[PDB]
Design a protein around this motif. Structure first.
Motif, mmCIF file in Angstrom:
data_model
loop_
_atom_site.group_PDB
_atom_site.id
_atom_site.type_symbol
_atom_site.label_atom_id
_atom_site.label_comp_id
_atom_site.label_asym_id
_atom_site.label_seq_id
_atom_site.Cartn_x
_atom_site.Cartn_y
_atom_site.Cartn_z
ATOM 1 N N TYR A 613 0.819 -1.207 0.000
ATOM 2 C CA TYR A 613 0.000 0.000 0.000
ATOM 3 C C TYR A 613 0.852 1.255 0.000
ATOM 4 N N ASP A 616 2.090 1.314 -3.710
ATOM 5 C CA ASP A 616 1.021 1.570 -4.675
ATOM 6 C C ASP A 616 0.444 2.972 -4.462
ATOM 7 N N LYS A 617 0.885 3.907 -5.289
ATOM 8 C CA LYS A 617 0.482 5.310 -5.159
ATOM 9 C C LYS A 617 -1.023 5.555 -5.450
ATOM 10 N N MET A 619 -3.539 3.284 -4.454
ATOM 11 C CA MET A 619 -4.373 2.421 -3.641
ATOM 12 C C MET A 619 -4.142 2.678 -2.173
ATOM 13 N N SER A 620 -5.204 2.841 -1.409
ATOM 14 C CA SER A 620 -5.099 2.897 0.039
ATOM 15 C C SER A 620 -5.818 1.656 0.600
HETATM 16 NA NA NA Z 1 -1.024 3.793 -1.486
#
Ligand code: NA
Ligand SMILES: *[C@@H]1O[C@H](CO)[C@@H](O[C@@H]2O[C@H](CO)[C@@H](O[C@@H]3O[C@H](CO[C@H]4O[C@H](CO)[C@@H](O)[C@H](O[C@H]5O[C@H](CO)[C@@H](O)[C@H](O)[C@@H]5O[C@H]5O[C@H](CO)[C@@H](O)[C@H](O)[C@@H]5O)[C@@H]4O)[C@@H](O)[C@H](O[C@H]4O[C@H](CO)[C@@H](O)[C@H](O)[C@@H]4O[C@H]4O[C@H](CO)[C@@H](O)[C@H](O)[C@@H]4O)[C@@H]3O)[C@H](O)[C@H]2NC(C)=O)[C@H](O)[C@H]1NC(C)=O
Ligand code: XEO
Ligand code: CA
Ligand code: NA
Ligand code: ZN
Length: 805
Positions: A613, A616-617, A619-620
């Protein structure tokens, strides 16, 4: 070619269809220009009209008459439907008190009560009450038999998709008739309302009731009537078939009326001109029932009065023009009107781009009366995507409006005042269902249901095994006095593991942190009891869902919630918790803001990780059981377990956090507690069915964490809201949704505002039946209640619509 030189003598309305070149005498021959030369003379007699008068009684049989009042007409089965009233002192059926039909009262040689399907086009549900003064025959069927206050059509709420849904129990995407107009790119062929391509058998999927009947040796009337055959003649033909010898006589019949739809398009749903079409349909119903009564069949036959869709007020000045939005309007083909479907005008155009078309159509005018969608983003309750005939780009049009390509389309084509086709939850599109007869209940009102359910019941009425369909067989058992189909619950396929504490903290390398380093015997035994399931009866009210496919999963217990954690998808399939009316909402303490905790019951290798997470820029993450609803500061720590975490786009976290922090509590206050089951859905090929792991198109970057296409919640409470959700004695009440997991909130034009102004409106649009979530997850809910299974099936098909009365 037809050698139309043969003759119809003795063959009028023959039940088998003769093959070319021999000429036809059946009720569809006109529509094919294939009738024998004498069809009109012999089969479509009109002389003297449709009713007996005093001075026709006893008359010498004149064969040229439309119907007869001679003494032998009962034996020939060809009296005018009013013969016994006019000539024999009888009363009209509508004038007789109704008396319960406890058993079928059929003549000798009837093996089963016949079924007559009386279908009406454009018959809006409110006509039952609003037109009740001018429809006494229909009113008597409705009040004396079984009725719903309305029946929900399928989307699009057009004529061909709905009539064929009624006949097959299938969604348009599965039966293939996805509009009145279609292009099939594999056939490279067009289906039209007008013309000869709509006759080709390759368009028509599933198995319609007339075919189901025939395959199982139940004889069917030829169901369809050429448009120019008058209603009176349709009725007499049906009644004549009803007098055939036992071995030749059909057990199922259909009648179709083009009204009130025809006038409703011209005059609007409640135009003053609409009264006469309603009177006329009622008169046809009177003719049928009088005719059944003359044949002593009025307490033998089951009659279904059923509509395809309603009718809304729509006029030419309420038209949106794609020419006001797109520069390249000539590069597109539009299927227009109460829905929009867009595709490239030319296959050879490599400058066509759906992404730029959708963006040009998105929230562009403050009052915009349509919303564009890629078809996989349409509300899952519509089930309108999994067919190559449904164009990738869809416009959902507001009720009362049209969409068109350019203004010239609307004046080189105001005529019309009514139309239909809108979203199938719109009140104006709802339609009618009445069942009357020995197999239906007496004076019984049943809740609204969907038209996809009826095929099963028509099969039940005729002793047929239904072909595989989208109904839920047993969900309409409450309509019937007998012939019920007694469904059994599906068997669980996968059984869960119940892991204990198996891992030390230092075995995890997930890159997560939590400020949980803050530290007792009675309290220690307490927490152990919670982790072994001590509170489970509180949070899992209806049993654990059953897993109906092969997979590896663990049941995890906590003070505040229980979950079924999938080692394959690395997240829960379901998380179940109960919130009482008295529950309090708390905030996430500051020190716990980014807290994620390893779960010592679950191996590192089957856990998500925080590093994915971080990397992955786009996706939170969020949680299925929300920390806002923890029962105590100590219980709150459970809500931050890595096994309660799910991947979420920041844009979607706006929706989810507001649902979790605000709306769940609101529902618990309003409903006297709620039980909540939430979880992920993966439907990458948009077939409405659970994806296998090899179908997942997106993962959290650099990881095997799959990204759900949707998030669901099922919110149950007691129907009698004077009892708390966790102490309910009787029927249940449910609402559910399947929220699309989207990287943006482009769907919601007001999303730059506070969530209080838009999130609940988004959720209402994406309302769902529990059954829709079952198909999408492979789970089976409500396994352990005190309710009968058929009642639970009805609850699972329930859809909370959010329309006014
Ligand atoms: Na993220
Ligand atoms: C609502 O209810 C309906 C009815 O129950 C549900 O639909 C069923 O879902 C099943 C799964 O999706 C599906 O089962 C498949 O059957 C395949 C054989 O299909 C033909 O035979 C049946 C039976 O007579 C027939 O009904 C089919 O009719 C379809 O197609 C024709 C013409 O193309 C149309 O006229 C008709 O309208 C209908 O179209 C609809 O369904 C198809 C899918 O079948 C869609 O593509 C359409 O858009 C439309 O929606 C057919 O004539 C069989 O081949 C399948 O098996 C494959 O997958 C299994 C997994 O079990 C695997 O074992 C096999 O290897 C096989 O894979 C191979 O083929 C792949 C595709 O080319 C290939 O990629 C692979 O590498 C393999 O080679 C499968 O078992 C069933 O057909 C439909 N039935 C109907 C009537 O639609 C629907 O799910 C319910 N909806 C919801 C939300 O619950
Ligand atoms: C309700 C029902 C349940 C179970 C079995 N059968 C049923 N019905 C369906 C409707 N019936 C008709 O005669 C139909 C009439 N039209 C309109 C039509 O032809 N126009 C030219 C507008 C249809 C269009 C389609 Cl796609 C399919 C059937 C019909 C009777 C049988
Ligand atoms: Ca799928
Ligand atoms: Na927006
Ligand atoms: Zn219409």
């Amino acid at each position: 070619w037809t050698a139309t030189s043969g003759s119809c003598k003795g063959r009028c309305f023959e039940l088998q269809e003769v093959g070319p070149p021999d000429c036809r005498c059946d009720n569809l021959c006109k529509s094919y220009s294939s009738c024998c030369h004498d069809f009109d003379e012999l089969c479509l007699k009109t002389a003297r009209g449709w009713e007996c008068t005093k001075d026709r009684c006893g008359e010498v049989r004149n064969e040229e008459n439309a119907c007869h009042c001679s003494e032998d007409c009962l034996s020939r089965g060809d009296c005018c439907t009013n013969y016994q009233v006019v000539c024999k002192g009888e009363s009209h059926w509508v004038d007789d008190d109704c008396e319960e039909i406890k058993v079928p009262e059929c003549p000798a040689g009837f093996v089963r009560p016949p079924l007559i399907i009386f279908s009406v086009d454009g018959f809006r549900a409110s006509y039952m009450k609003k037109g009740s003064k001018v429809m006494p025959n229909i009113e008597k069927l409705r009040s004396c038999g079984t009725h719903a206050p309305y029946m929900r059509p399928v989307y699009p709420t057009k004529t061909f998709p709905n009539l064929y849904t009624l006949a097959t129990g299938l969604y348009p995407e599965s039966h293939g008739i996805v509009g009145n107009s279609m292009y099939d790119p594999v056939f490279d062929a067009s289906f039209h309302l007008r013309g000869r391509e709509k006759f080709n058998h390759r368009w028509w999927g599933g198995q319609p009731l007339w075919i189901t009947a025939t395959k199982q040796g139940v004889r069917a009337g030829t169901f369809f009537w050429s448009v120019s055959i008058p209603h009176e003649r349709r009725i007499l033909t049906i009644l004549q078939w009803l007098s055939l010898p036992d071995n030749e006589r059909p057990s199922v019949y259909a009648f179709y009326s083009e009204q009130p739809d025809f006038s409703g398009h011209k005059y609007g749903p409640f135009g003053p001109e609409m009264t006469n079409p309603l009177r006329e349909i009622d008169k046809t119903v009177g003719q049928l029932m009088d005719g059944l009564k003359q044949l002593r069949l009025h307490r033998c036959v089951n009659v279904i009065f059923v509509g395809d869709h309603g009718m809304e007020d729509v006029t030419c000045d309420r038209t949106e023009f794609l020419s006001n939005y797109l520069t390249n309007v000539d590069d597109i083909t539009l299927v227009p009107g109460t829905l929009g479907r867009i595709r490239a005008k030319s296959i050879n155009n490599s400058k066509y781009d759906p992404k730029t078309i959708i963006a040009a159509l998105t929230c562009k005018k403050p009052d915009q009366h349509f919303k564009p969608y890629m078809k996989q983003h349409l509300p899952k309750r519509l089930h309108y995507a999994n067919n190559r005939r449904i164009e990738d780009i869809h416009l959902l049009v507001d009720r009362r409006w049209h969409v068109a390509r350019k203004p010239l389309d609307v004046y080189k084509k105001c005529f019309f005042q009514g139309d239909h086709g809108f979203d199938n939850k719109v009140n104006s599109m709802q339609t009618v269902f009445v069942g009357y007869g020995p197999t239906f209940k007496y004076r019984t009102k049943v809740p609204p249901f969907e038209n996809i359910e009826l095929y099963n019941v028509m099969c039940d009425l005729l002793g047929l095994k239904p072909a595989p369909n989208n109904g839920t067989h047993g969900s309409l058992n409450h309509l019937l006095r007998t012939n019920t189909f007694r469904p059994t619950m599906p068997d669980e396929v996968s059984r869960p593991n119940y892991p204990g504490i198996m891992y030390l903290q230092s075995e995890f390398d997930l890159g997560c942190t939590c400020d949980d380093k803050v530290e007792n015997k009675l309290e220690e035994l307490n927490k152990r009891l919670h982790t072994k399931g001590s509170t489970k009866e509180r949070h899992l009210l209806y049993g654990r869902p059953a897993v109906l496919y092969r997979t590896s999963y663990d049941i995890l217990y906590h003070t505040d919630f229980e979950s079924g954690y999938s080692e394959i998808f690395l997240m829960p399939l379901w998380t179940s918790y109960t919130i009482s009316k008295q529950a309090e909402v708390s905030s996430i303490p500051e020190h716990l803001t980014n807290c994620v905790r390893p779960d010592v019951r679950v191996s590192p290798g089957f856990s998500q990780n925080c590093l994915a997470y971080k990397n992955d820029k786009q996706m939170s993450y969020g949680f299925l059981f929300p920390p806002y609803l923890s029962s105590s500061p100590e219980a709150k720590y459970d809500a931050f377990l890595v096994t309660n975490m799910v991947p979420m786009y920041p844009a979607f976290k706006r929706v989810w956090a507001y649902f979790q922090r605000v709306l769940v509590k609101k529902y618990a206050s309003e409903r006297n507690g709620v039980n909540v089951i939430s979880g992920p859905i993966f439907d990458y090929n948009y077939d409405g069915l659970r994806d296998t792991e090899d179908e997942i198109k997106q993962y959290v970057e650099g990881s095997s964490i799959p990204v759900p296409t949707h998030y669901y919640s099922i919110i149950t409470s007691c129907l009698d809201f004077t009892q708390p959700a966790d102490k309910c004695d009787g029927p249940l009440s449910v609402s559910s949704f399947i929220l699309p997991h989207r990287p943006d909130n482009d769907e919601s034009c007001n999303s730059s505002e506070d969530e209080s102004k838009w999130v609940e409106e988004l959720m209402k649009m994406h309302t769902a039946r529990v059954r829709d979530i079952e198909h999408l997850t492979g789970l089976d809910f409500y396994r352990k209640t005190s309710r009968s299974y058929s009642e639970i099936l009805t609850l699972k098909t329930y859809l909370h619509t959010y329309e006014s009365e």
